[PDB]
């Protein structure tokens, strides 16, 4: 019951939907095809309800990980970009929109954690995690602190744990191996040990969460934090002279944050799949189309190479893409639930001092 000859697009209200509506205006002026952009509340929860009965939008924008369950239910059509179009996007962004060897969405934007620092308290941010204890000593003598970030959630602590060899599921040729988990290896032990040592040596508080860390950095009480592009607007209001750079390395190896990819899927029940392909490939995924959305609300880093190179003149965006390329695409498989439990459990047990790092990791699996 989706109307044929027009396009209905769903995108979250936190995105530049008025900018996207301008791209739809250009598409209608050129092709005669009316495009209607909507930002319904909780669209990612409404989509599987209406798409299951042949309803819903023609196009849906959301984070790539949710599209795994959509394709599992057969709600997303397979897209058909040729070789030349795929070369215009960074190769790793296509890994985020693949389900069982099939492309099921177009990569739009790229987000990842970065190292955020106070330029006044710290003109040169550290390049390594090993420097941070000495840096905290010099800052604690001034009533300040070196680093405060959300220790309570594994999304924020995994980049350090993965740095020396930790991994979620062994990634091969677009297929995750649910049997090869890398949470209890020598790389993950060294990262958690350094994290726990930061807490035991009183450089970080084991109770610091997202809200505490954000308040301390925006009030100038700490020199660094770790967060993503979604947090920049709160710092802009704080008027703190901040910068965004690459995450510190551990044992000479980069921090490996998870990568979220805003993706555009095509409804499997849509009768306008070719129009949807034409709109996404030839109007939106261009320098002109992404700029219209970006002008409305910034996308952060984008998958389109040519426009990312322009946006990367903002050093905060360049750092975001740099950390993302040094990180890993967040897996879109249901087995991530068990992975999150293991990492969250091992950190809380080891940080409080109840268990050793080795005991904390092996007990999180059992």
């Amino acid at each position: 019951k989706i109307e044929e000859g027009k396009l209905v697009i769903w995108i979250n209200g936190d995105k530049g939907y008025n900018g996207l509506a301008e791209v739809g205006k250009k598409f209608e002026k050129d092709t005669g095809i009316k495009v209607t952009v909507e930002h319904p509340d909780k669209l990612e929860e409404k989509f599987p309800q209406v798409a299951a009965t042949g309803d819903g939008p023609d196009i849906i924008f959301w984070a790539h990980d949710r599209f795994g369950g959509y394709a599992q239910s057969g709600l997303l059509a397979e897209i058909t970009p040729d070789k030349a179009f795929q070369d215009k996007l960074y190769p790793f962004t296509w890994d985020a929109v693949r389900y069982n060897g099939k492309l099921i969405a177009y990569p739009i934007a790229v987000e990842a954690l970065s190292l955020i620092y106070n330029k006044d308290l710290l003109p040169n941010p550290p390049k390594t995690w090993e420097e941070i204890p000495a840096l905290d000593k010099e800052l604690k003598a001034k009533g300040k602190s070196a680093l405060m970030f959300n220790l309570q959630e594994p999304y924020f602590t995994w980049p350090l744990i993965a740095a020396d060899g930790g991994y979620a599921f062994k990634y091969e040729n677009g297929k995750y191996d649910i049997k090869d988990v890398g949470v209890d290896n020598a790389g993950a032990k060294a990262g958690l040990t350094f994290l726990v040592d930061l807490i035991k040596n009183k450089h970080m508080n084991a109770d610091t969460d997202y809200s505490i860390a954000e308040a301390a950095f925006n009030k100038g009480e700490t020199a660094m934090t770790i967060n993503g592009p979604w947090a920049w607007s709160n710092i802009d209001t704080s008027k703190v002279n901040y910068g965004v750079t690459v995450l510190p390395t551990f044992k000479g190896q980069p921090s490996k944050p998870f990568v979220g990819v805003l993706s555009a899927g095509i409804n499997a029940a849509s009768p306008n799949k070719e129009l949807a392909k034409e709109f996404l490939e030839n109007y939106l995924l261009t320098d002109e189309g992404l700029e219209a959305v970006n002008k409305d609300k910034p996308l952060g880093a984008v998958a389109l190479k040519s426009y990312e190179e322009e946006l990367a003149k903002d050093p905060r965006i360049a750092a975001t893409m740099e950390n993302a390329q040094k990180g890993e695409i967040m897996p879109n498989i249901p087995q991530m639930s068990a992975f999150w439990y293991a990492v969250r459990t091992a950190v809380i047990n080891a940080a409080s001092g109840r268990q050793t790092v080795d005991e904390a990791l092996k007990d999180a699996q059992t």
């Epitope: 909780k42 990612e44 929860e45 309800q49 999304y155 979220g260």
Partner: antibody, heavy 124, light 104 residues
Framework: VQLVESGGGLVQPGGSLRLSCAAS????????IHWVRQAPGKGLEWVAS????????SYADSVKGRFTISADTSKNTAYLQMNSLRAEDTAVYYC??????????????????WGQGTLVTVSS | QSPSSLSASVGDRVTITCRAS??????VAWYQQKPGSAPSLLIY???SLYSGVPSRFSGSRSGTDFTLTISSLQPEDFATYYC??????????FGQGTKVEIKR
């Protein structure tokens, strides 16, 4: 979109009771399901939560070690297993949904949907 | 805990301050509960009005203080109001209830 509760009733101190929260209209896997109880004439008290997508469960101090929250994704239903019950556990028990957009978010959106509540009386 | 009491008239402006939110600076939600019914969400993230709630309800944050304001009390507004915080992200605490009652 609905949250239907069942499993309440009478129970003795030291006994056990298992509450159920069957959901429809959304997938509990991608939400936090909360249990909130309210003693007669008293205010709300948070009990436990489960966020299966993020592999997390949480418990209030007053029930930690005695209650166990779980979920059955195939049945779209959450459970509260209450053990070692005491008279102070007597209350109307609600289940509620807390919405989440992204994996990085802290709690933001509160509890938009609530069950009808079921009365649990712990007494000899 | 037994809920606090506040007596007001139709048309009055009422401002409720969350007492449990003095713990931390996290997001604050407000709820309305009538006798014999489940609470209903009014406001989330301190100031975002939940879909469908009348615009006379508003929430604000000024530093560590979170308030809920009813600009002009309507007859259907006399009920009990709760604020909800998340001190450590995993923990959840509801404040003491504030029951708005009818002046006569």
């Amino acid at each position: 979109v609905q949250l239907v509760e069942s499993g309440g009733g009478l129970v003795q101190p030291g006994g056990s009771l298992r509450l159920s929260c069957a959901a429809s209209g959304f997938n509990v896997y991608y939400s936090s399901i909360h249990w909130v109880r309210q003693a007669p004439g008293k205010g709300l008290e948070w009990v436990a939560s489960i966020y299966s997508y993020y592999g997390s469960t949480s418990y209030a101090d007053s029930v930690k070690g005695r209650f166990t929250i779980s979920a059955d994704t195939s049945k779209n239903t959450a459970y509260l297993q209450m053990n070692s019950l005491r008279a102070e556990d007597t209350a109307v028990y609600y289940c509620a949904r807390e919405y989440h957009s992204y994996v990085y978010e802290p709690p933001l959106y509160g509890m938009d949907y609530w069950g009808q509540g079921t009365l649990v009386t712990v007494s000899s | 805990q037994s809920p606090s009491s506040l007596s007001a008239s139709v048309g009055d402006r009422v401002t409720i301050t969350c007492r449990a939110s003095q713990s931390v600076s996290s997001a604050v939600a407000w709820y309305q509960q009538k006798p014999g019914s489940a609470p209903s969400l009014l406001i989330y993230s301190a100031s975002s009005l939940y879909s469908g709630v009348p615009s006379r309800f508003s929430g604000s944050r000024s530093g560590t203080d979170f308030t809920l304001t009813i600009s002009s009390l309507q007859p259907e507004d006399f009920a009990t109001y709760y604020c909800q915080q998340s001190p450590q992200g995993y923990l959840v605490t509801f404040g003491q209830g504030t029951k708005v009652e009818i002046k006569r």
